């Protein structure tokens, strides 16, 4: 196999299924991945970088610091609100904000540092009982609080849709959340809200018809 192969491949259904290409960013999800399988994805010309555990995107943000090489991280897993301190310096983008606490203490801690912190909102939009994300409802609530918090850049949102091989629950999740940036960037945003956090490797094709701007894909890259 080959990363490179792989990641050029990715670009190429990026073109096919997108309905705006020029848009859409890789993520590649390295939570599993060795600093040297990292340094590879890095060598195909791509440099964001997904991870879900604090410890761990602490410690690579460190290792490639010292190693001098440019990453866009991002945060894609669940955030603590006392582990905010520790990634608020060198994350280009949180994209699982999933309530106002959470993006309180994200713009505390970014106000301290003197920056302004881009985030997504995370919507539960198929409403699994493992839940994290936020409701409709809920964020519509949130929504004046948030818009005030003066240190946060909200520029889209994000979802999960469990695994499935239904193309069409695939497709009802991802236009859900489509039509919800959609309203909010009508009712509330003033359309500054351009992307959309969804999609990884087992149907991101499905999420770049759907509109995605982001697809966080994994095993497809590095396996």
């Given at each position: 196999m080959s990363i490179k192969a792989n990641v050029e491949e990715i670009l190429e259904d990026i073109k096919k299924y997108?309905?705006?290409?020029?848009?859409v960013k890789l993520v590649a999800?390295?939570?599993?991945?060795?600093v040297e399988d990292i340094e590879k994805f890095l060598e195909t010309g791509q440099n964001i970088c997904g991870e879900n555990k604090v410890q761990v995107i602490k410690d690579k943000i460190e290792y490639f610091k010292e190693k001098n090489k440019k990453i866009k991280w991002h945060f894609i897993g669940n955030l603590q609100k006392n582990k905010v301190k520790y990634i608020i310096d060198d994350v280009?983008?949180?994209?699982?904000?999933?309530k106002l606490s959470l993006a309180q203490e994200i713009n505390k801690k970014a106000e301290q540092s003197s920056k302004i912190m881009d985030v997504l909102l995370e919507i539960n939009?198929?409403?699994?009982?493992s839940k994290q994300g936020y409701s409709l409802d809920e964020l519509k609530c949130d929504i004046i609080e948030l818009q005030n918090l003066?240190?946060?850049?909200?520029?889209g949102v994000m979802t999960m849709a469990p695994f499935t091989d239904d193309e069409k629950i695939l497709r009802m999740v991802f236009s859900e959340l489509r039509k919800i940036k959609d309203e909010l960037n009508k009712e509330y945003f003033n359309n500054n809200l351009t992307e959309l956090s969804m999609g990884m490797s087992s149907d991101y094709k499905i999420a770049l018809q759907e509109g995605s701007t982001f697809i966080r894909v994994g095993t497809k890259i590095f396996k």
């Open positions: 997108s309905p705006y290409p020029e848009k999800v390295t939570k599993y991945s060795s280009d983008l949180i994209h699982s904000v999933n939009v198929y409403g699994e009982e003066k240190n946060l850049n909200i520029i």
